[PDB]
Design a protein around this ligand. Structure first.
Ligand code: HEM
Length: 153
């Protein structure tokens, strides 16, 4: 349950991410993989990557980072009426990639960490709270569909 003012902070924050999406997606994935090497084993494309520098040099990693943030933004722009956008995500990540909720938590922490890091004095308390709630809603909505799909998560 986010207010309309809270959603409008989410949409503003996400507008800043989309205007600089290559860097944002790259730092989010790197924060995820260095902080939680177990999540890397889910990416056939990336599991060969060992150091942060290899990660910063992969055009593929940068490309997929933009796929991630772009898809997340589509969900966030629907702000609590996002069922159509969550469905194919939950479908593929439950049925095909097999991503536990715990990893969606990791990537949410990473997004917030990158948002703090990249926007000094421009990512204030209202925006942080709003983003934290929006990402919590996303993970919960996915976990609910995970169960309808018979995937533990
Ligand atoms: C905010 C969270 C996430 C978003 C918005 C997101 C979005 C996407 C999208 C749009 C795709 C491509 C189409 C698809 O397969 O559905 C994808 C692929 C994938 N996702 Fe995620 N994803 C998220 C989290 C994660 C996490 C945390 C993992 C952890 C391992 C993961 C593992 C994968 C894999 C393995 C693929 C296929 C990659 C490939 O083509 O080689 N996803 N994701």
């Amino acid at each position: 349950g986010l207010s309309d003012g809270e959603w409008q902070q989410v949409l503003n924050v996400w507008g800043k991410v989309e205007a600089d999406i290559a860097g944002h997606g790259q730092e989010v994935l790197i924060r995820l993989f260095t902080g939680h090497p177990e999540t890397l084993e889910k990416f056939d494309k990336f599991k060969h990557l060992k150091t942060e520098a290899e990660m910063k040099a992969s055009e593929d990693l940068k490309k997929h980072g933009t796929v991630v943030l772009t898809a997340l933004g589509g969900i966030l722009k629907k702000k609590a009426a996002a069922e159509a956008e969550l469905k194919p995500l939950a479908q593929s990540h439950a049925t095909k990639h097999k991503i536990p909720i715990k990893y969606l938590e990791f990537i949410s922490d990473a997004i917030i960490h990158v948002l703090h890091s990249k926007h000094p004095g421009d990512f204030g308390a209202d925006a942080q709270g709003a983003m934290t709630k929006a990402l919590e809603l996303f993970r919960n909505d996915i976990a609910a569909k995970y169960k309808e799909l018979g995937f533990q998560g």
